Amino acid sequence: ILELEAERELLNPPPSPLDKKFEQWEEQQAVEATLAAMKARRS
Amino acid sequence: ILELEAERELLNPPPSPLDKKFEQWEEQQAVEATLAAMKARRS
Amino acid sequence: AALDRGNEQLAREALGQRQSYQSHTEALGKSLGEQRALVEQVRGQLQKL
Amino acid sequence: AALDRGNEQLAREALGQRQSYQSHTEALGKSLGEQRALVEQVRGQLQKL
Amino acid sequence: QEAPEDLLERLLGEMELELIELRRALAQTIATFKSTERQRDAQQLIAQRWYEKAQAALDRGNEQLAREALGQRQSYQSHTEALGKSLGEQRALVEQVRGQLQKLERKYLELKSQKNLYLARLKSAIAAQKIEEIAGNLDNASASSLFERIETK
Amino acid sequence: ERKYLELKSQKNLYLARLKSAIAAQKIEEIAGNLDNASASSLFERIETK
């Protein structure tokens, strides 16, 4: 199983820890920015 | 029986505990809001 | 008839029962509204036709 | 419906759920926009043709 | 060699058969997962029946009998702990494998969506060239034989 | 006897993983056929055509 599991890991390289950090970073901005209007729209 | 019961659970995923919380939360609002008029209409 | 004379408890369950029908009511209402544009469109096709 | 009455916490998760759909929405939107120039081009080919 | 356009339909079909195979395989995992849960519950009930018996023993000062009762419960308790840890471990597995599948199905239909779009272009291009070469037969450079040759005749 | 059923319990769990893994690889290699590096022949070759 580990043999096959590793085989794919080669063919589909995992996303770098970098873009993981940025996607998490950027995503938190959209929710806060998007939520910012609502918390001000109907405060 | 458990084999078949689980088979459906895959094909029709259960509603998340999230929407369960919100539907219960929102539903309590309609009954109270709807009942609010009656308790004030014919107090 | 329920909360009159101060029997509010019974009224609570009554409206809760209504809510199940209310949910089914809303879905049909939106479904009914959607179909109207369709039948008007198809008849208009035929009348031009 | 969430952050009304000060229940901001629930709203946070709700928008987070929307973001997954939002990402899929953006990809389709750009894909939809791209295809329009193609169909206009190919029809224009045929009309001249 | 076969036309790769035909392979496009057949290749997706093969992947469809496997998706249901994974589908049935996952259920087998869940079915066993539930069964292990029940066995833990039954044994602790036996231990509880021994504890509820111990909820009858040392009363009135018959402590000796209670001692043996809990000792009996300990054998079930040891088996209970192993299943509990085993049950906890499996939960992350089933969540992981389902998450794999859920991400997986989306990737399928997305590929299927692009399948027809590129087939349309190929039909367009083949439907595009096969005429203009015939229009090329009526070339203005006299390479034509249908049109200029008859005029010279 | 306890040792027997315990072994039998683990039997199916590891068989499930093997079916998962084999059911896991045989698709992504087909997804690999649509690789973005032009190693594909089904998708990029037709476009170049």
XYZ file of C-alpha atoms in Angstrom:
386
model
C 0.000 0.000 0.000
C 2.804 2.411 0.881
C 4.432 1.439 -2.419
C 1.360 2.496 -4.399
C 0.674 5.514 -2.181
C 4.187 6.841 -2.771
C 3.893 6.133 -6.501
C 1.119 8.710 -6.867
C 2.949 11.193 -4.648
C 5.613 11.287 -7.361
C 3.143 11.692 -10.226
C 1.081 14.401 -8.464
C 3.550 16.389 -6.351
C 1.975 17.843 -3.211
C 1.381 21.600 -3.081
C 4.318 23.323 -1.443
C 4.058 24.478 2.177
C 4.372 27.956 0.667
C 1.065 28.128 -1.217
C -0.536 26.338 1.730
C 0.526 29.279 3.894
C -0.649 31.876 1.376
C -3.974 30.226 0.555
C -4.682 30.000 4.281
C -3.440 33.575 4.663
C -5.403 34.938 1.703
C -8.521 32.923 2.549
C -8.698 34.437 6.041
C -8.674 37.837 4.332
C -11.699 37.134 2.131
C -13.812 35.874 5.042
C -12.855 38.857 7.198
C -13.165 41.343 4.332
C -16.424 39.766 3.167
C -17.679 39.577 6.760
C -16.545 43.175 7.331
C -19.382 44.500 5.169
C -21.997 42.375 6.947
C -20.831 43.336 10.441
C -21.075 46.963 9.286
C -24.110 46.513 7.028
C -26.410 45.167 9.772
C -24.397 45.884 12.930
C -27.976 -5.107 7.352
C -25.181 -2.805 8.512
C -23.522 -3.420 5.142
C -26.575 -2.156 3.258
C -27.283 0.609 5.779
C -23.765 1.989 5.368
C -24.023 1.683 1.580
C -26.794 4.287 1.467
C -24.986 6.517 3.955
C -22.297 6.899 1.293
C -24.740 7.610 -1.534
C -26.820 10.116 0.487
C -24.371 11.865 2.823
C -25.976 12.976 6.085
C -26.572 16.698 6.611
C -23.652 18.234 8.452
C -23.946 18.996 12.171
C -23.619 22.615 11.045
C -26.907 22.989 9.159
C -28.536 20.896 11.882
C -27.495 23.589 14.359
C -28.648 26.440 12.121
C -31.964 24.889 11.098
C -32.707 24.267 14.771
C -31.470 27.780 15.546
C -33.405 29.454 12.730
C -36.530 27.362 13.326
C -36.741 28.493 16.958
C -36.702 32.056 15.622
C -39.706 31.596 13.330
C -41.846 30.033 16.071
C -40.910 32.767 18.542
C -41.194 35.546 15.955
C -44.441 34.105 14.598
C -45.730 33.534 18.137
C -44.602 37.049 19.101
C -47.419 38.599 17.066
C -50.050 36.299 18.582
C -48.918 36.880 22.170
C -49.152 40.610 21.407
C -52.166 40.405 19.085
C -54.491 38.776 21.648
C -52.507 39.150 24.884
C -57.501 29.242 20.255
C -54.422 28.116 22.213
C -52.606 30.924 24.041
C -55.921 32.595 24.860
C -56.528 32.464 28.612
C -52.771 32.119 29.064
C -52.146 28.620 27.661
C -49.107 29.724 25.675
C -47.413 26.317 25.880
C -49.944 24.647 23.586
C -49.602 27.439 21.025
C -45.852 26.822 20.781
C -46.293 23.231 19.603
C -49.110 24.244 17.252
C -46.954 26.709 15.312
C -44.116 24.186 15.278
C -46.457 21.796 13.493
C -47.379 24.577 11.060
C -43.700 25.109 10.257
C -43.396 21.695 8.597
C -46.286 22.628 6.309
C -44.825 26.121 5.896
C -41.560 24.702 4.548
C -43.439 22.583 2.005
C -45.584 25.621 1.194
C -42.572 27.792 0.349
C -41.021 25.240 -2.011
C -44.254 24.840 -3.974
C -44.784 28.600 -4.085
C -41.374 29.220 -5.622
C -41.887 26.253 -7.947
C -45.298 27.620 -8.931
C -43.853 31.065 -9.633
C -41.077 29.668 -11.815
C -43.421 27.678 -14.054
C -45.511 30.726 -14.994
C -42.777 32.288 -17.132
C -42.354 28.936 -18.890
C -45.993 28.512 -19.915
C -46.205 32.136 -21.049
C -43.047 31.659 -23.117
C -44.189 28.428 -24.763
C -47.636 29.812 -25.600
C -46.019 32.931 -27.036
C -43.911 30.648 -29.205
C -47.052 28.907 -30.471
C -48.999 32.121 -31.069
C -46.184 33.538 -33.199
C -45.938 30.079 -34.748
C -29.427 35.540 9.435
C -26.329 34.629 11.473
C -24.498 37.616 12.974
C -27.806 39.365 13.640
C -28.377 39.637 17.390
C -24.616 39.341 17.841
C -24.002 35.711 16.815
C -20.983 36.597 14.693
C -19.285 33.230 15.245
C -21.836 31.325 13.166
C -21.520 33.828 10.318
C -17.772 33.187 10.107
C -18.221 29.491 9.324
C -21.061 30.247 6.904
C -18.925 32.489 4.692
C -16.086 29.977 4.901
C -18.441 27.410 3.404
C -19.388 29.915 0.696
C -15.718 30.358 -0.194
C -15.427 26.785 -1.482
C -18.339 27.470 -3.829
C -16.884 30.898 -4.627
C -13.631 29.342 -5.846
C -15.533 26.965 -8.130
C -17.688 29.899 -9.241
C -14.684 31.966 -10.341
C -13.154 29.175 -12.430
C -16.405 28.569 -14.309
C -16.939 32.296 -14.815
C -13.544 32.746 -16.443
C -14.077 29.548 -18.432
C -17.498 30.803 -19.525
C -16.062 34.154 -20.605
C -13.305 32.531 -22.651
C -15.669 30.313 -24.642
C -17.770 33.245 -25.882
C -15.058 34.567 -28.201
C -14.649 31.047 -29.595
C -18.297 30.517 -30.533
C -18.522 33.998 -32.046
C -15.383 33.302 -34.081
C -16.538 29.914 -35.361
C -19.994 31.202 -36.309
C -18.393 34.149 -38.085
C -16.304 31.647 -40.018
C -19.455 29.780 -41.061
C -21.410 32.913 -41.981
C -18.616 34.093 -44.276
C -18.383 30.489 -45.449
C -3.067 2.319 -33.750
C -6.621 3.205 -32.766
C -7.894 6.763 -32.966
C -7.185 8.452 -29.602
C -10.581 10.139 -29.915
C -12.251 6.753 -29.404
C -9.941 6.075 -26.455
C -11.255 9.238 -24.797
C -14.710 7.702 -24.354
C -13.432 4.240 -23.416
C -10.816 5.520 -20.958
C -13.416 7.417 -18.932
C -15.618 4.321 -18.890
C -12.866 2.293 -17.246
C -12.450 4.969 -14.577
C -16.210 4.877 -13.964
C -16.107 1.157 -13.138
C -13.348 1.731 -10.590
C -15.123 4.648 -8.911
C -18.010 2.376 -7.944
C -15.428 -0.240 -6.935
C -13.943 2.277 -4.502
C -17.534 3.164 -3.625
C -18.379 -0.396 -2.593
C -14.972 -0.813 -0.952
C -15.500 2.194 1.316
C -18.830 0.848 2.567
C -17.113 -2.392 3.573
C -14.794 -0.281 5.726
C -17.676 1.602 7.361
C -19.694 -1.564 7.975
C -16.836 -3.104 9.949
C -16.258 0.199 11.750
C -19.811 0.159 13.112
C -19.552 -3.496 14.144
C -16.427 -2.869 16.217
C -18.320 -0.055 17.943
C -21.086 -2.401 19.098
C -18.684 -4.989 20.513
C -17.171 -2.325 22.762
C -20.643 -1.297 23.930
C -21.715 -4.869 24.695
C -18.624 -5.690 26.750
C -18.800 -2.545 28.879
C -22.439 -3.438 29.536
C -21.216 -6.785 30.864
C -18.696 -4.839 32.932
C -21.529 -2.517 33.944
C -23.585 -5.586 34.852
C -20.608 -6.625 36.968
C -20.393 -3.101 38.387
C -24.140 -2.989 39.041
C -23.611 -6.322 40.759
C -20.781 -4.559 42.581
C -23.508 -1.982 43.194
C -25.044 -4.772 45.286
C -22.015 -6.454 46.891
C -20.259 -4.344 49.535
C -23.601 -2.986 50.734
C -24.308 -4.251 54.251
C -20.563 -4.734 54.676
C -19.888 -7.643 52.292
C -16.801 -6.001 50.819
C -15.101 -9.316 50.022
C -17.563 -10.198 47.261
C -17.163 -6.759 45.682
C -13.405 -7.291 45.363
C -13.801 -10.351 43.136
C -16.557 -8.658 41.130
C -14.359 -5.729 40.092
C -11.512 -8.135 39.366
C -13.795 -9.858 36.877
C -14.661 -6.464 35.382
C -10.964 -5.730 34.878
C -10.603 -8.479 32.266
C -13.434 -6.879 30.295
C -11.975 -3.433 31.003
C -8.670 -4.390 29.375
C -10.472 -5.625 26.259
C -12.606 -2.474 26.354
C -9.579 -0.164 26.291
C -7.957 -1.883 23.308
C -11.133 -1.651 21.231
C -11.674 1.966 22.256
C -8.226 3.008 21.072
C -8.666 0.892 17.942
C -12.054 2.510 17.329
C -10.603 5.999 17.748
C -7.764 5.319 15.320
C -10.040 4.116 12.519
C -12.115 7.316 12.496
C -9.331 9.441 11.009
C -8.848 6.782 8.325
C -12.457 6.707 7.124
C -12.651 10.503 7.142
C -9.437 10.665 5.112
C -10.522 8.094 2.531
C -13.951 9.683 2.063
C -12.307 13.084 1.688
C -10.133 11.560 -1.016
C -13.232 10.300 -2.835
C -15.174 13.554 -2.479
C -12.308 15.538 -4.000
C -12.008 12.714 -6.521
C -15.498 12.731 -8.044
C -15.302 16.469 -8.753
C -12.158 15.830 -10.799
C -14.043 13.298 -12.934
C -16.980 15.400 -14.131
C -14.619 18.334 -14.704
C -12.578 16.204 -17.104
C -15.783 14.927 -18.708
C -16.925 18.520 -19.253
C -13.811 19.329 -21.283
C -14.098 16.097 -23.285
C -16.870 17.253 -25.615
C -15.537 20.800 -26.001
C -12.300 19.593 -27.606
C -14.178 17.019 -29.673
C -16.296 19.884 -31.001
C -13.181 21.768 -32.097
C -11.813 18.686 -33.861
C -15.097 18.287 -35.731
C -14.952 22.006 -36.504
C -11.376 21.833 -37.789
C -11.980 18.713 -39.886
C -15.256 20.266 -41.018
C -13.185 23.393 -41.686
C -10.346 22.058 -43.843
C -12.191 19.563 -46.028
C -14.108 22.374 -47.754
C -11.399 24.972 -48.337
C -9.233 22.378 -50.074
C -12.227 21.962 -52.388
C -12.371 25.747 -52.564
C -8.659 25.390 -53.250
C -9.570 23.274 -56.264
C -10.953 26.538 -57.655
C -7.667 28.354 -57.052
C -6.958 31.521 -59.025
C -3.404 30.405 -59.902
C -4.541 27.960 -62.639
C -3.589 25.007 -60.443
C -7.291 24.225 -60.856
C -8.409 21.724 -63.480
C -12.185 22.019 -63.058
C -12.540 25.720 -63.828
C -9.649 27.220 -65.796
C -9.066 24.115 -67.918
C -12.624 24.165 -69.285
C -12.294 27.868 -70.113
C -9.074 27.290 -72.051
C -10.907 24.457 -73.809
C -10.343 -18.676 20.583
C -10.147 -14.974 21.453
C -6.928 -14.755 19.437
C -8.718 -16.193 16.395
C -11.624 -13.762 16.047
C -9.265 -10.867 16.793
C -7.124 -11.861 13.812
C -10.261 -12.354 11.715
C -11.408 -8.838 12.630
C -8.229 -7.302 11.214
C -8.422 -9.447 8.066
C -11.117 -7.424 6.305
C -9.795 -4.035 7.434
C -6.494 -4.517 5.595
C -8.280 -6.020 2.597
C -10.368 -2.844 2.468
C -7.228 -0.705 2.338
C -5.778 -2.822 -0.472
C -8.990 -2.401 -2.459
C -8.842 1.311 -1.655
C -5.222 1.643 -2.773
C -5.729 -0.359 -5.972
C -8.973 1.547 -6.496
C -6.900 4.660 -5.768
C -3.977 4.289 -8.178
C -5.726 2.905 -11.250
C -7.599 6.190 -11.757
C -4.888 8.779 -11.145
C -2.644 7.092 -13.702
C -5.550 7.672 -16.092
C -5.714 11.206 -14.728
C -1.976 11.125 -15.367
C -2.766 10.416 -19.010
C -4.119 13.976 -19.010
C -0.870 15.366 -17.608
C -0.112 19.054 -18.105
C 3.478 18.359 -19.232
C 2.457 17.240 -22.763
C 3.350 13.642 -21.916
C -0.329 13.125 -22.741
C -1.337 11.907 -26.191
C -5.127 12.039 -25.820
C -5.479 15.738 -25.038
C -2.530 17.881 -26.128
C -1.850 15.894 -29.302
C -5.357 16.522 -30.657
C -5.023 20.242 -29.904
C -1.732 20.470 -31.795
C -3.481 18.606 -34.613
